[PDB]
Design a protein around this ligand. Sequence first.
Ligand SMILES: Cc1nnc2ccc(N(C)Cc3ccc(F)c(F)c3)nn12
Length: 125
Amino acid sequence: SMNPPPPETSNPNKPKRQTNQLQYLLRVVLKTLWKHQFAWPFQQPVDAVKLNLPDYYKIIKTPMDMGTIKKRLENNYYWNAQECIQDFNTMFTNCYIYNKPGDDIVLMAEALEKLFLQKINELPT
Ligand SMILES: Cc1nnc2ccc(N(C)Cc3ccc(F)c(F)c3)nn12
């Protein structure tokens, strides 16, 4: 049930950038989603040893979570809003891939995805 190293939250040879949309993704999108009653499974990388999911990283090869996204936004790791939005979408699709329709955690990810899309529908200019 080995855990791989968590996804990087900095990369010295990757260029950094800051935009109004990336500041909004941290201040409004991430920090509001974080407080949702169903955010807690997604606030840190999946710990296969703690959670007893020894096949999690046998299935999920591009893991992602909101704790990683938060640190990436705080580091100015992303070039643009779309790069950050792809990490949220990877986090949701990983949940759907590892589990099955109707599972409690899938119902959680479905509700968070809807709220996420509602908030990114309109971004600052
Ligand atoms: C499965 C699975 N797939 N991705 C993840 C991420 C986190 C995660 N935890 C914390 C355990 C858990 C199990 C069932 C749940 F209903 C739930 F809310 C949470 N489990 N999980």
